[PDB]
Symmetry: D2
Subunit: 281 residues, 4 copies
């Protein structure tokens, strides 16, 4: 699979004890593809509350998400972990399930050197033999020299650096991670995008992407205005519980956020009701 296109960053529903609700998760995954008409799912990224999960729950998410959608759906498995043994084990498990590529967040918390960051990606690639999507221009170059590093999920909203990476690496995949600047990413030549709000707003996101590349820039930007009202509202109410409340409105068992995230605050119910009416969410 060419990995171009638009991906929902897959949300995960939990019960009160922080266990995955598998029925709700299957429904969320199918919502992304069938209702929001997206190209694929980005599984166990930050938007999935991945970093709050134990290893067996991560595996549980990968399997459920894979068995919920058809064979033509593009699937990217985020497997980064500060525990490299865990990253490799998740990488092998996702590869065996048939995920089209892995990705891995930059090793964090500790001040890792670039050399340490580089060999963390190279070690995961070596053990899994799958394609890898990563998260400075001389450094990018050394990462992207690797033929199995097919791309970057670019989340730093610096359009100068984006433009430099675009031109420097015309043949690698660039997927942007900032929903609220989709139209700017699009005219900057990204090959697609990954976003949490595409779970509820993937149809507008598609129009933004398509229309911007078709020269219809005013129309794409108007839809960005509309999408940015939604994104701003959802951010102000607590992004992941509120996205899942919007889904729950659709009859989906969207459950609860995993503690220490708190549930949607009902003080926001009226404003959320107004948003959902305004934009037909």
């Amino acid at each position: 699979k060419d990995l171009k296109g638009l991906y929902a960053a897959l949300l995960v529903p939990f019960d009160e004890n922080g266990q995955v609700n598998e029925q709700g998760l299957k429904q969320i995954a199918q919502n992304a593809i069938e209702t929001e008409e997206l190209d694929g799912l980005y599984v166990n990224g930050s938007s999935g509350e991945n970093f709050l999960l134990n290893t067996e729950q991560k595996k549980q998410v990968f399997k459920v998400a894979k068995e919920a959608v058809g064979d033509k759906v593009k699937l990217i498995a985020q497997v980064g972990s500060l525990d490299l043994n865990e990253a490799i084990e998740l990488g092998k498990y996702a590869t065996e399930l048939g995920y089209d590529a892995l990705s891995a967040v930059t090793p964090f918390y500790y001040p890792f050197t670039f050399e340490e960051i580089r060999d963390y990606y190279f070690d995961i690639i070596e053990a899994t033999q799958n394609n890898m999507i990563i998260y400075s221009i001389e450094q990018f170059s050394e990462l992207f020299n690797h033929e199995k590093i097919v791309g970057v999920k670019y989340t730093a909203p610096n359009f100068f650096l984006l433009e430099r990476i675009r031109k420097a690496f015309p043949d690698k995949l660039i997927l942007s991670g900032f929903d609220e600047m989709l139209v700017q990413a699009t005219i900057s030549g990204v090959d697609g995008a990954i976003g949490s709000t595409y779970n509820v707003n993937g149809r507008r996101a598609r129009k933004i992407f398509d229309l911007a590349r078709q020269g219809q820039i005013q129309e794409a930007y108007q839809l960005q205005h509309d999408s940015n009202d939604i994104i701003e509202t959802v951010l102000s109410m607590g992004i992941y519980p509120t996205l899942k409340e919007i889904l729950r409105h659709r009859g989906i068992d969207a459950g609860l956020p995993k503690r220490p995230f708190k549930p949607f605050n009902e003080a926001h119910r009226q404003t959320l009701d107004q948003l959902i009416a305004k934009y037909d969410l």
Copy 2:
């Protein structure tokens, strides 16, 4: 009428002699280069790019006078008069206004942690004393309060944040927005800016105008290709010392581009070959 000042502006560079005095003939050549050669809509005079904050009050007036004399009546003129000395800001604002500059602008008061009310009344005091239109440099609720002033016509927007820019464009459809980041002109353009102010348009304003025009005509691919070209230029000049290097490019065209004012140091000759290579490649 808030949109009268739309368009593309050179942030006017200033040549100095060895004692940090304005070279007036070189300044006239720079102003004329921006309008006649680079084909820009106007000059932004005494901003950061003119080393404004290194100047005494007399030198600022001198630059305002010469820039204005150098251009025809149809060329748009914006006078940056911000200063931590509010008395000086008012003096320069009155002076620039009597000269016939079409608006004033003023950088956000800096150095000290000023409160928003102090920043607000800094602008309100300049406006009250000069009665000219004002362009500002802060949340959306804070923008709303500043833009409720009939004489605050718009903003020169330099924050690298396209979420806030979009929010501002949506919230203030009839205010002037001019972007100040040359390396993101194409993104600013599709985000609905009414124009741009740039130091690199002194040497690259023809590409800048094509980027602006092609992007608004939806020729997005061709606009973006010109942004790649411009960004090679911008990245190169930033790496050599922006103001001195821009002036060296101007010197190549036969302009009396002089020196930067200390404590900026002159163009370092170790960069000479890399610069000549850039000038040849992009025909600068």
Copy 3:
């Protein structure tokens, strides 16, 4: 109940080439801290132990080995913080059952958690474990955390001596343990109750003198020992702090193993400079 004041080694962990805990060396490292470095306690599974690189089973393994290594009088604090609250609760219960004197938990990180989220993360761990807790934010918020009788103190790592003085003043009944070895003398005169540090694994004798001399008002001599300690700290930082501390320990005949990847091993290009440091300061 033990008094928790005093000086603690942040316990380092030796690994084999597969990132598995070396139980033999871990025991030697724990015993070095108490018996050679003369420290009051161990701070187990903190950042310095490469805790955030471990799986749950390995964290329990380290808790168990450290406890087994030390006498009944040794103070033991178990860092159980995790982005996975279920894991943090489970490690908290396990360490309490081992008999650890207090738990601590890093601030939930990575995500932009609200304060109420952070507060209730601490309160949740407490309800489940019933152990005393040490936290890692304005004075107004500290008040809300310290209001809890089971939040007994703070391991204070932010390099800001104005916030430190305010917290000391406002909360005279709470334990403050500073985590910046290179500013021990400044923390001591600011009234901290003790300190936790990774370099006390190799420089614990000098740290005790800094602490004691400074409280006794012999400030000039404490500050000279801070100069000497900071030569060591700067050097060790410039070489990769965790691998280098463990190299110094190896020199005393401890099986200090390897760091866990993605941390890289001690670069041998540093060996001569490290040999010199060990000679100069008799480490």
Copy 4:
């Protein structure tokens, strides 16, 4: 040639409604610093003096008045830094001609100047004035700056006590004056030669006691005085430091005038809390 050790008031300036210096109030403020606060010297035309808001003639005016207000024993440091280097040299010569013991200059700001540009700005002022200079940057770059015979020290304002300790150790013979009032006690035990502060205009007596007691090793008493000083500092920062400090002086019968716009005057809604602090601390 005066030694420059000790405690300096960062001289506050009173203005009228048009932003002109109230010269009579300025003398009162200079004299209060030396005669009531019992301070060693005055730091003139720094940030606390609203210096960067002034025109050249006003800066000269402030230098002249402050000098004439104090006796021959008083140490005087003239801050002459400006983004206009021609103005800085002019001010440098003027202050030198009036007999200021040293010059100082803030780090060139606003633009992103290279270290080579910052270095040559200092070197240029020194070369035109021939006076001693205090600077405001890594250790290697400090080593290059301090290699100049006429760079005699540094007004150290970065709240970083690891770098302070490194500088103190690497430059045993240079003058280090700290600029953080709220951390005077930590600076003192770190071996600073003295301190410059705006709050010493109203609290120099406590400041001196903190400085002397800490150096005499009565660290518990010095720390308590810092608790009281930080109460004051935390309150006046919360109300707008410059205007509030001057309001405290007005209360002493001093003509404290107004701040220069765009600073706003003291807001009367803080009156109650201020009166209460002045009461508690006898200011």
